[PDB]
Design a binder for this molecule. Structure first.
Ligand SMILES: CC[C@@H](C)C(=O)O[C@H]1CCC=C2C=C[C@H](C)[C@H](CC[C@@H](O)C[C@@H](O)CC(=O)O)[C@H]21
Ligand SMILES: CC[C@H](C)C(=O)O[C@H]1CCC=C2C=C[C@H](C)[C@H](CC[C@@H](O)C[C@@H](O)CC(=O)O)[C@H]21
Ligand SMILES: CC[C@H](C)C(=O)O[C@H]1CCC=C2C=C[C@H](C)[C@H](CC[C@@H](O)C[C@@H](O)CC(=O)O)[C@H]21
Ligand SMILES: CC[C@H](C)C(=O)O[C@H]1CCC=C2C=C[C@H](C)[C@H](CC[C@@H](O)C[C@@H](O)CC(=O)O)[C@H]21
Ligand SMILES: Nc1ncnc2c1ncn2[C@@H]1O[C@H](COP(=O)(O)OP(=O)(O)O)[C@@H](O)[C@H]1O
Ligand SMILES: Nc1ncnc2c1ncn2[C@@H]1O[C@H](COP(=O)(O)OP(=O)(O)O)[C@@H](O)[C@H]1O
Lengths: 372, 373, 404, 410
């Protein structure tokens, strides 16, 4: 494998204006067996991304050391300060509210009257039952939970929402969708399948549907930071924090015309954790959706109550980049690497809770720096 | 020193539920001098991301070999197929339509009548001059182009837009914003500066303002793919490609309630190039905004015309992750590493054009795969 | 002539005596007199005392208005009503009343109807039906609101809620619950049928009973507002576009090439190019959610005002995506469809209780309740609205394409 | 008389004219051109329509007599069969910018006027409200296409040069003494170019004037770029009568802000609640709730109710309530003990006018006169329309206050 990468590098070198540029791009002593035929093509090396650690993050009575891969200065230090504030506040609590990856194909019928007939059929328990039967027959973990349909004339967009064990689930859900569509075509032979993804999923593009209905894991996290911790650790006050949160995260985002971006920098934390843990970094587009809320709490309204709600965290602990060793090391640091053998899907849910809690730590710290 | 990283890892390991977790996380023989105190803190190692190459991408009469860092199978191969189709079609053309990073702080006055007065003041050629003077004094490259202000009662949101040479510009623009706001405060002492970023920028969150007014570089790219190339390379037809594009990228995205997501997978290409080239990957949120259009072209309407328009590519070739050697290697592969001394900003603009062109190659290929069945 | 107050009648005497204004009917002889007295009192307060000379008020039936549709009444505003049709829809022919002050709107809609008629008519289908109300409640902690969401998601939890909700009316039938969390806040979207009524009052009453029941199981729950903007009523919202509100309807027709050329004065190809670049691409560039159409709001508003609907509901009722494509053997005929997911409409209650508005509803054959099939009149009216919108879209798009 | 002898085409009976129409000799819509009296044409159309209805007497209660159709015909409506009376109520006085207004509201929604009236009372007892017009400019957003994206990029660069803009501005402004092309916002989508023209329009809402200026400006632009194709005078980039982020962010028509402080005592006595309760409802409903619903511009309780009622009463285009209703309502604890209520309403896109369209009808002018803004402001062109926009924003704030208080009360 290594020799093949060396040769490809040599061939590529002939096509560059600055062939000496490759000298600083590492490639030696790396496990390419796990990469080939699976994670990347035309490999010429690897890009090292610095990994820092923030923690301990006291979440649901457990302590986590969160790995973060980034090239942005202050991010890890800031997130670490947020964790500290949460720890001194007795820790954070989280809950997974929903779980289901989606795929939203588009099909078309000769007339809108026909597509309406198909939608009505898909809404009967009998129609759902046969579609679920076809969808689920593709893999052990593919378990269809619900369907959401929407028509545009003779076009019909069908959003399939399904469980997928500990996997992020796109390949699995796509395979299930394809067989369900084949089955639907048997019931409606005049139906033309236009695209397995008609952007109704919605995958890797901002979309109100993900914000409102959720995609992947929907999670909520919360904590109460004592007034003394707000002053001594965050170097500010509860009142200033609340004023910034409302006018930045709520009013500011509204003025900017944001759908799902009611937070300070959830995307920084999501991206850093995703890269470190072998997730699909491009999914930061929808996985970053977040609304951050803050209120005065306690005896004299001097304590800070904070919560972060993320309805569409697209994540997994098996498959894709999580198959690589360095990435598995970071997943193991968190205790969620691979399949949860006793209860499939539990490692992915735990990782989603960790992401939401670290986002909250990051929000706390940046808002405090903005307020101060 | 590297021994610092080794000790941190050792201390860290005793706190883990599986103390051998760190075994496969590499850390040795990496230049931490450029990382320490600049790109990351509490360093325990590095995460290798596979880098593949797609090309040549025939763009504006030049040929590029595009590095892509990803763990997603088929992405590089697919993008490479798109490049091939474009090359056989005579190449692609691109134009940078606008350039300016932004920062949108929020300030507040005692009353809305007062904030309305500040808005009117900032809209006069005189008021703007004073602000522009304070802003531009922070840097040679920081040149304020304009202001867009919005009121929500007594709150005033002010969007500062400025060029920044070849740097992405966040730090530069933020520093200029702070000096400009301090000057503004001299004229309106009752003004309270609530936050240097009031989410009106908008940075790293989806926002209609970035889609409509742009942020960073706004770029358009286009190409015509011959009917023979569509059939032989993309394995489909122009008519099928157009039908999928309209019903997926336009109608589908509209049904999903998308603002800026009128494309197939621009985010895949943007993220892969960003990680390879030392950009801020979290900026994929807004940098991925894209509308992909396709239509029939030629004598018999059998050729495929395609265009991708990206109004908010946040990118740079100097500063941040671009200071690291491996990342500079990828920037050098493209011929855009560092500052362009004779024409400040030209390297960053060229990188933005390359990103838009590679996104178009990726769109072509995925749409063909969707259409082909 | 006005004699002392203790002795007090004439207009001057009542006015002299007054100096509530809004309580004039509960004091004066008839309805028209209370209004007349209200106008005289008001005139004194105007920089221009004779402002009201041309605001009509006489010979109007205020009995149905007082304490039901409007307060502090000083008269009525006449809105011209025109008719467009026949609209050939689902093998029936409709004469559609349109109340507007916008020139060319009725004439243009009438031309669209003509093109549809010559094309063999239009077909429509009601895809969903259910008015909503989205209150916001709060628990002490997010962990508690998460528990409430889960309980509401159980078949037994939803059962008790539905029973309480359904107990408020015979027409009130809870179809589903969409719950959304924001920290310790819980937004609950109740969706239910409501016979032929638009349903706002009915659904609000049912929501109040349902929340009271929910409070029995979760005493720490604080009901913040019966409407937490999650409905969403009278504000643009992605939730209405994606999940629907009121009636979701689709309509379609095929216009022959000859009709496109001779009636619409354009070509199928030009019509399609304008539709894609205006209604799809243009709306996307403007950052629209639900506004993928040319002027659905013009038609919706005109029909609403004529038929006694809540005109303010045009905000969400106007959501529409208009699609056009080539059809037929030669591929030169024009296929058009309009999809409107959130038409908020009714044929009983509110403004539909007034006689002039009932006249327009009767013109369409949908006035009042449908005793044999509850909800059928409201569904028919929704189909008529969608079909008239399509007629209007056809005509405006043709004008834009041909430069008229 | 037979159809033939009826070749006298006020000398024919309604029955004879109806016979001609049924025999296909006359199109029903052209009735006004043949009949020498507007109300008679309305009368005949009603009779023709009756015979087409499943219920022939359904028009009995639709009024049509004694209405001035001369101002309507060939201007405001076609195929007229009568008029629809909408009840008009009054809310006030609205104490705004040291003036007192009696606001007419046309509606069929119970409690609306009473509620708005209560909000006005709270504002009055609080010392009144203040407002400011932040921007003014109607828009039109056509879409044109060039052969290639490289060409559309060139046209965009050209329009951005001071000299390229001057030429376009000259052509645009030549259509009216009230037209003043303030700015151009251009957006590219491949080879398509969307150009948003923005200009003042005196006291008119301005759609007609701005569309005429745009048509002239594009013709001029075509002289410089003959390869350019004008696809549609409106490419939905305006944006007119459809929800759109562009109107929310850049404004359309008049952008206005209004504010007031309601004393704790007034919140209790008039609104029957507390400042704390009202703030909790406002944040969780108008900000958080609207965010959860995926709203762009709908950060308010019921601005659309007030906008629609005033629009119908004053002869505005009611269909424009779609974008004119955009509003963000903010409430904040004010005062020595955080018990007084600060409130503000910001509406960036109020599309309104006091001349032209429905404002040409007499009953509508009566309502505009009640407010003191009817017609053109001779002394300061545009001032009447700006004053009406301020009144709308202030009445919306009164309505928001009252509904939020009712929601907070239970
Ligand atoms: C308890 C309030 C709700 C449920 C309601 O029925 O109050 C009605 C009846 C009693 C008092 C009222 C006062 C002011 C308003 C005109 C209001 C109806 C407003 C309605 O037309 C729009 C809302 O639905 C928008 C929202 O808040 O989502 C009206
Ligand atoms: C607006 C943030 C200010 C001006 C800034 O430069 O702070 C930097 C330098 C000093 C301290 C910091 C602490 C925490 C963060 C990692 C922060 C950078 C955050 C940035 O990556 C995203 C924001 O721009 C989003 C926003 O608030 O709009 C970072
Ligand atoms: C979505 C298409 C199908 C189902 C799929 O899995 O094809 C995979 C495997 C085979 C070939 C491929 C070629 C090009 C792409 C990199 C593609 C995966 C793209 C994915 O990362 C984002 C899409 O889901 C976006 C969308 O279309 O909504 C990839
Ligand atoms: C938009 C076309 C131009 C500028 C215009 O004035 O045509 C007028 C006059 C001549 C013919 C017409 C035919 C049909 C319509 C009722 C139209 C006015 C439509 C207007 O009320 C909303 C549009 O502006 C929405 C849009 O297309 O963006 C009307
Ligand atoms: N706990 C688990 N959850 C999900 N998939 C699992 C698990 N354990 C093993 N697998 C397997 O791994 C695969 C899922 O990964 P992958 O093929 O990359 O698809 P996806 O894109 O859905 O993650 C399936 O073949 C499945 O059988
Ligand atoms: N029917 C109505 N018409 C107009 N305004 C009303 C009406 N009812 C109430 N209001 C408004 O509400 C305010 C007080 O209402 P409320 O507290 O219910 O007492 P009351 O019974 O005296 O109206 C009044 O000052 C008025 O502005």
């Amino acid at each position: 494998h290594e020799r093949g990468v060396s040769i490809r590098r040599q061939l590529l070198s002939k096509k560059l204006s600055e062939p000496s540029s490759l000298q600083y791009l590492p490639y030696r002593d790396y496990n390419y067996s796990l990469v080939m035929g699976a994670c990347c093509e035309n490999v010429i090396g690897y890009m090292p991304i610095p990994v820092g650690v923030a923690g301990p993050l006291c979440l649901d009575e457990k302590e986590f050391q969160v790995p973060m891969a980034t090239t942005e200065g202050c991010l890890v230090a800031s997130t670490n300060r947020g964790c500290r504030a949460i720890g001194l506040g007795g820790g954070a609590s989280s809950r997974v509210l929903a779980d289901g990856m989606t795929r939203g194909p588009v099909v078309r019928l000769p007339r809108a009257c026909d597509s309406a007939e198909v939608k009505a059929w898909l809404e009967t328990s009998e129609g759902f039952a046969v579609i679920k039967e076809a969808f689920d027959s593709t893999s052990r973990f593919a378990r269809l939970q619900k369907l959401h349909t929407s028509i545009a004339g003779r076009n019909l967009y069908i959003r399939f929402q399904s469980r997928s064990g500990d996997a992020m689930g796109m390949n699995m859900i796509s395979k299930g969708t394809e067989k369900a569509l084949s089955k639907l075509h048997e019931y409606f032979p005049e139906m033309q399948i236009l695209a397995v993804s008609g952007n109704y999923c919605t995958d890797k593009k901002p979309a109100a549907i993900n914000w409102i209905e959720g995609r992947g894991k929907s999670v909520v996290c919360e904590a109460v930071i004592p007034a003394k911790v707000v002053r001594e650790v965050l170097k500010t006050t509860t009142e200033a924090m609340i004023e910034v949160n409302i006018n930045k995260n709520l009013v500011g985002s509204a003025m900017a015309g944001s759908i799902g971006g009611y937070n300070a920098h959830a995307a920084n934390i999501v991206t850093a954790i995703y890269i470190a843990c072998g997730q699909d970094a491009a999914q930061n587009v929808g996985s970053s959706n977040c609304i951050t809320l803050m209120e005065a709490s306690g005896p004299t309204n001097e304590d800070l109550y904070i919560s972060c709600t993320m309805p569409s965290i697209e994540i997994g602990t098996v498959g894709g980049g999580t198959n690589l060793l360095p990435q598995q090391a970071c997943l193991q640091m968190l205790g969620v690497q691979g399949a949860c053998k006793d209860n499939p899907g539990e490692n992915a849910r735990q990782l989603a809770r960790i992401v939401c809690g670290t986002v909250m730590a990051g929000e706390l710290s940046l808002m405090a720096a903005l307020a101060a």
